[PDB]
Amino acid sequence: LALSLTADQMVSALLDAEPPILYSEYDPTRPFSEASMMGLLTNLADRELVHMINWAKRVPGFVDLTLHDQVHLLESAWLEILMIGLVWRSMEHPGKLLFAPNLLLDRNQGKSVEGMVEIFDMLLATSSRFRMMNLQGEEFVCLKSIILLNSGVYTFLSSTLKSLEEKDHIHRVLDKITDTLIHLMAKAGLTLQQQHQRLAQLLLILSHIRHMSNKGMEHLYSMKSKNVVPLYDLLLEMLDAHRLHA
Amino acid sequence: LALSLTADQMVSALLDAEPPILYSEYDPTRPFSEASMMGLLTNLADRELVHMINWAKRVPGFVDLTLHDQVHLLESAWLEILMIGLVWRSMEHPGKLLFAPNLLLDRNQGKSVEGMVEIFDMLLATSSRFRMMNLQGEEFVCLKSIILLNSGVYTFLSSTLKSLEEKDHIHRVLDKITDTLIHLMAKAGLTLQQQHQRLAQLLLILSHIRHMSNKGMEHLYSMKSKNVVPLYDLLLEMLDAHRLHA
Numbered sequence: 305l306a307l308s309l310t311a312d313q314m315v316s317a318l319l320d321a322e323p324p325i326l327y328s329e330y331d332p333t334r335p336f337s338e339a340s341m342m343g344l345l346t347n348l349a350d351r352e353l354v355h356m357i358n359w360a361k362r363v364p365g366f367v368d369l370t371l372h373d374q375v376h377l378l379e380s381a382w383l384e385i386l387m388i389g390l391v392w393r394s395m396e397h398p399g400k401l402l403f404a405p406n407l408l409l410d411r412n413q414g415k416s417v418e419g420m421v422e423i424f425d426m427l428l429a430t431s432s433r434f435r436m437m438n439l440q441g442e443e444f445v446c447l448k449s450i451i452l453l454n455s456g457v458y459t460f461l462s463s464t465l466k467s468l469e470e471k472d473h474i475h476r477v478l479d480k481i482t483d484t485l486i487h488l489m490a491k492a493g494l495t496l497q498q499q500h501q502r503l504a505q506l507l508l509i510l511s512h513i514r515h516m517s518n519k520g521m522e523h524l525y526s527m528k529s530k531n532v533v534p535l536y537d538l539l540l541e542m543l544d545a546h547r548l549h550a
Numbered sequence: 551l552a553l554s555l556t557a558d559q560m561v562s563a564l565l566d567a568e569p570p571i572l573y574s575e576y577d578p579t580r581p582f583s584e585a586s587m588m589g590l591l592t593n594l595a596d597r598e599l600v601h602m603i604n605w606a607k608r609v610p611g612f613v614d615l616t617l618h619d620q621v622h623l624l625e626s627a628w629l630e631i632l633m634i635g636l637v638w639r640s641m642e643h644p645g646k647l648l649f650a651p652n653l654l655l656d657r658n659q660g661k662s663v664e665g666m667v668e669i670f671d672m673l674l675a676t677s678s679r680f681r682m683m684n685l686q687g688e689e690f691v692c693l694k695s696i697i698l699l700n701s702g703v704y705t706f707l708s709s710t711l712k713s714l715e716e717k718d719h720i721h722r723v724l725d726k727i728t729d730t731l732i733h734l735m736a737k738a739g740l741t742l743q744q745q746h747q748r749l750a751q752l753l754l755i756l757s758h759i760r761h762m763s764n765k766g767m768e769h770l771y772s773m774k775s776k777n778v779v780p781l782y783d784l785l786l787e788m789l790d791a792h793r794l795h796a
C-alpha cells in the first residue's frame with residue numbers, strides 16, 4: 305500500500321516512475337522557419353500525454369482511485385504536469401526552454417503565436433526560481449506528484465460515500481508526500497526552520513504553475529476547435545486498459 | 551522592521567490590520583428580484599477594494615516596497631483576496647456564500663450570470679474545506695498575507711538591482727509568515743509531523759484560490775468593457791497617497 309511506504313520508498317517509487325524525455329518530430333535537414341511552432345509543440349504534447357498516463361499509474365496511491373476520479377485528476381492537471389516537466393529540464397538552460405533536446409527555444413521564438421511570449425516568460429521565470437532554489441530531482445518528483453493529486457481534488461463533482469473515501473485517500477497520500485519532502489530536506493542538512501520555509505517556498509510555486517496552466521488553456525481553447533473526442537473520453541480510453549498484456 | 555517581528559507580533563499585526571465587513575448597497579424594502587445580482591457584487595467589490603489597500607499597507611513589509619511593486623502585487627492578488635475573505639466569512643454557512651451580512655446567497659442564485667454558478671460551487675467547496683480543516687482566524691490572516699505577497703512575485707517585469715532587492719525582501723517576509731504559521735500550530739498542540747502536513751494542506755488550497763481568481767477574471771474581462779481608467783492606474787492613485795492627513 306502507498307500509505308505504508310517509507311520516505312525513501314516513496315522517493316524510489318517516484319524516481320522509478322519517471323517518464324522518458326521525448327524528441328520533437330521534424331526533419332532536422334530542412335528549413336526551420338518552415339515548420340509550425342505550435343504544430344511542433346502540439347505533437348510533442350500529445351505524445352507526452354501517453355507517457356504521462358503510465359507515469360500517473362505508477363504514482364503510489366493513484367490506481368487505488370476509481371477510473372472516473374483518475375481521469376478527473378489528469379484532466380485538471382495535465383498541462384501543469386507538462387509545464388513543470390519542461391521547467392525542470394530547462395533549469396540549466398538560462399533564457400531558454402528545453403521543450404525537447406532538439407527543440408531549445410528562447411523568448412523571441414514564441415512571438416509566432418498569440419499569448420505565447422507571455423507564457424514563455426512565465427515558464428522561464430519559474431525555471432529561474434528553481435535554479436535559484438537549487439531544486440533537487442527528488443524534490444521535483446514529489447512536486448509533480450503533488451500536482452497530479454491536488455489540482456483536481458477540490459473540483460470533485462460527487463459527495464457520495466465513495467467520493468468522501470476517495471478524497472480522504474488523496475489527502476492521506478498528499479500528507480505522505482509532504483513527509484517525504486521534509487525527510488529529504490532533513491537528510492540534506494537543513495534545520496527545522498529551513499525545512500518548513502523551503503516546503504512553503506516550493507508549494508507556493510505550484511500556484512504560479514496553476515496560473516500558467518490557466519492562461520495556457522485560455523489560448524488553447526480559443527485555438528482548439530477540432531470538434532472531436534473530448535479530452536475526458538480520450539483520457540478514459542487510455543486509462544481504462546485491459547490486463548491482457550500483463 | 552517586519553523581519554524583526556516575532557511570531558506573536560506578526561499575528562497581532564495581521565489581526566489588527568483586518569478590514570471591516572461591508573454591507574451590500576440596496577434598499578431592503580424593495581423586491582429583490584429587481585436588483586442586479588452582478589450589480590450588487592460589483593458595487594460591494596469596488597468598495598472593499600478601498601479597504602483592501604489600507605489593509606495591505608498594514609501588512610508588515612508591504613510599504614517597504616516600491617509604489618510600483620505594491621501596485622503590481624495588488625493588481626495580481628485583489629480577486630484572490632476578496633475570495634479568501636468571502637470563503638472565511640461563509641465558513642459557518644454551509645451551502646451559502648456570505649458576500650455581506652445582508653447578502654447571503656446559495657448555489658442557485660448564481661445562475662443569473664454566465665459562469666457564476668461554477669465559481670459559486672468552487673467557492674462553496676473551498677469554504678467546506680476550511681470548515682473541515684477547522685481553519686483558525688490567526689491562520690486565515692497569515693494565508694491572506696501570503697496571497698498578497700506571493701501572487702505577483704513571479705511576474706515582476708524588471709531585473710534591476712532594486713528589483714532583486716525587492717524580491718529578496720518579499721521572500722524573507724514570506725518566510726517570516728511561514729514561521730508564524732508553524733508557531734501557531736506548535737502552540738495549538740500539533741506534533742511536528744502534523745505541523746508540516748497542515749502547512750502543506752493550507753498552502754495547497756492557495757492554488758485552488760488562484761484557479762478561482764483566474765476563472766473569475768476570464769468572465770469579468772468578457773464583461774468589463776467600460777473603456778475607462780486601467781486598474782493599475784486606479785490602484786496607483788489609491789496607493790500613492792500624501793501624508794497631509796498624517
Ligand SMILES: CS(=O)(=O)c1ccc(-c2ccc3cc(O)ccc3c2Oc2ccc(OCCN3CCCCC3)cc2)cc1
Binds near residue numbers: 346387423528535
Ligand atoms: C497558444 S499558448 O501560447 O497559450 C501555449 C501554452 C502552453 C504551451 C506548452 C507549454 C509546456 C509544454 C511542455 C511540453 O513538454 C510539451 C508542450 C508544451 C506546450 O505546448 C502545448 C501545445 C498544445 C497543447 O494542447 C493541445 C494538444 N493536446 C490537447 C489534448 C491534451 C494533450 C495536448 C498543450 C501544450 C505552448 C503554447
Ligand SMILES: CS(=O)(=O)c1ccc(-c2ccc3cc(O)ccc3c2Oc2ccc(OCCN3CCCCC3)cc2)cc1
Binds near residue numbers: 766767769
Ligand atoms: C461573472 S463571474 O461569475 O465570473 C464572478 C466572479 C467573481 C465574483 C466575486 C467573488 C468573490 C467576491 C468577494 C467579495 O467580498 C465581493 C465580491 C465578490 C465577487 O463579485 C465581484 C464582482 C465584480 C468584480 O470586478 C469588477 C469590479 N471591480 C473591477 C476593478 C477592481 C475591483 C472590482 C469582482 C468581484 C462574482 C462573479
